[PDB]
Chains A and B, each alone.
Chain A
């Protein structure tokens, strides 16, 4: 029996940590809403 708890405001932070890469990926989306990698 699920419940919610507030965790913060939705705000852009100046000088947040900047990270992660930017990959271009071929994918398919099935009727169950699962993404899969094509090739």
Chain B
């Protein structure tokens, strides 16, 4: 099937019509999304069957057909872009300066852009085009806008 490096929608037919449940990244023969999108299930790519390879509910990540390949980081200074892929709408770059999730284990990048839940797994990029993490796992603040992390995996 399709293995071209790039960005993809995650769809289901199990509900009314064709529903977009999230987004992921294809890089070096491996597909990357968030755990809450697929819950570890197998995916189809036309006549192809993508099997889960690695997943961790706490990180809220999962890779298909091989180990996690993305190992770029928000450098804490430079702006970024959410390559938002919203349900039934064209891919759109949005440029933002991320804020910070302070936790007991350390500090994480955060973006306060409210897209529908089916946008989960859209990639966040640095100025060289490198994927520094995925969108869709954070918190809703008083303001009603969701704040998502910059969720990034460890390459082995």
Given contacts A1-B44, A3-B44, A10-B7, contact A25 B93 (CB under 8 A): no
Which of the four size classes fits the interface of chain B?
Answer: 35 or more
Q: Report Cα–Cα, A22/B79, bound state, in Å.
A: 10
The answer, yes or no, to whether B153 is at the interface (CB within 8 Å) is: no
Across the A-B interface, how many residue pairs have beta carbons closer than 8 Å?
151
Q: Which of B8, B31, B42, B102 lies in contact with A5, CB distance below 8 A?
A: B8
Are B58 and A2 interface neighbours, CB within 8 A? no
Q: Report Cα–Cα, A35/B76, bound state, in Å.
A: 20
Q: Which of A6, A25, A37 lies in contact with B2, CB distance below 8 A?
A: A6
The answer, yes or no, to whether B81 is at the interface (CB within 8 Å) is: yes
2-27 of chain A: CB within 8 A of chain B: 2-13, 16-27
Binding site of B, secondary structure by majority: helix, strand, loop or mixed?
Answer: strand
Give 10 pairs: A residue, B residue, CB < 8 Å, sorted on A.
A4-B11, A5-B9, A9-B7, A10-B7, A16-B81, A17-B94, A17-B95, A21-B112, A24-B100, A35-B101
Interface residues of A (CB under 8 A from B): 1-13, 16-29, 31-33, 35-37
* Extra contacts besides A1-B14, A22-B100 (17): CB < 8 Å: A4-B24, A4-B31, A4-B45, A7-B9, A10-B131, A12-B125, A13-B81, A13-B93, A17-B92, A22-B99, A22-B112, A23-B147, A24-B100, A25-B139, A26-B102, A35-B138, A37-B139
